[model samples]
Target: TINVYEAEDPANTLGGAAVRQRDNAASGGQYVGWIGNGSNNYLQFNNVYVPQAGTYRMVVQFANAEVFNVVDRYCSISVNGGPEKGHYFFNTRGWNTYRTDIIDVYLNAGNNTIRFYNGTSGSYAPNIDKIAIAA
Candidate 1:
């Protein structure tokens, strides 16, 4: 129940725009092919933005089973299309349900993609839940 904004022009639509959601878990194999929700789709953010420009909240909720054999959690993104943000560090080696950072991220007005590249990268099942913006 969170909202994400990547406006094309300029606007702080985080708490004002409609909700953006990501569903990485598929049971009927509805997601076994292209448009891989939990696979290797890099730029999944394209329709929201914060025109007002200021600090926003960053959140992550892991609803997937822990991949005991793997060291990387997989799905990632960046601000201004920089590098993959949120790298697992420290005690995350054992924590399954985790939130990387509740940060006060500064955003600019106009098209901003909270780009995410996730393919259920972990052998364990998981969901992005939401990385939302409010205000």
Candidate 2:
């Protein structure tokens, strides 16, 4: 089975994040923005469930509008309170433009917490649309 989790889900913990409806390309026409580059800016997806514990394909849908800028966007992903791994996002030219990347992630059986934040203090994290996890 495959499950898709929205970044703007109210059940998610958005510390300094804001929800935006400007992106028509985003799933459900809404996404989480303003994540990272701040002390409180982060997004946490709670209760990601799977039938078994192992590595699975995680598809991250996002957008970065830092076109032609020197500063690239990044997001650090952490699972189950574990150590974070940073991922870079290339500029998609517009905030409303979207892209997707696939990465392998480990998740425990039942519910697991997945977090996204800017690991670098001076860089901003890309706008997150959603994440799809394969069960």
Candidate 3:
């Protein structure tokens, strides 16, 4: 398991204040992910090619959002080579930080592909981190 702490102080300040370090952004955008639009857009990953690896767990911890209303949702984690999957509507209700964190995923031993898609059409979250992948 890899530990990612916050490096800067942002709006939410939950993860930022709670954590000292953050997961370094994945290089080559391989292990990295994307956050969706701000209050009126879509967030998605495209044709992400990853080598299969052992069973793994991807944990996404939400920091905060600019808006909140159930409709302002976060979701859709597609995984290839394992049971690892995602959600579409993780609410960013409070200031910064979500009640739930971490999504379990099974990965193969080579390369795998995963993407996060925001289900909301127009609502933005702030400073969201990709899953903390553990194998």
Q: Please report, in order, the local distance difference test score of every candidate based on alpha carbons.
A: 0.42, 0.82, 0.41
| Candidate 1: regions farther than 4 A off | 1-40, 69-74, 89-104, 118-126
Worst 10 residues of 1 by lDDT: 27-36
What does the lDDT come to for candidate 1? 0.42
Write model 3 residue lDDT over 28-62, tens digit each, in one string: 12221234442112223223223564555655655
Q: Give candidate 1's error at residue 62 in angstroms.
A: 3.7
**Model 2 bad stretches (over 4 Å):** 17-22, 68-71
Model 3 is weakest, by summed lDDT over 10 consecutive residues, at 9-18
lDDT for 46 (candidate 2): 96
Pairs of residues at least 3 apart in sequence or in different chains that clash in candidate 2: none
Clash statistics: count for each candidate: 16, 0, 30
Angstrom error of the Cα, residue 82, model 3: value is 8.8
* Per-residue accuracy of model 1 over 1-135 as CA lDDT, tens digit each: 136422221322222112234333322111111212443444344544676777778664433334455444444456676665544422243333433435345667875656544445322222334455766
Winning model by TM-score: 2
Model 3 ranges with Cα > 4 A deviation: 2-34, 37-54, 66-72, 81-100, 123-127
Order candidates by lDDT, high to low.
2, 1, 3
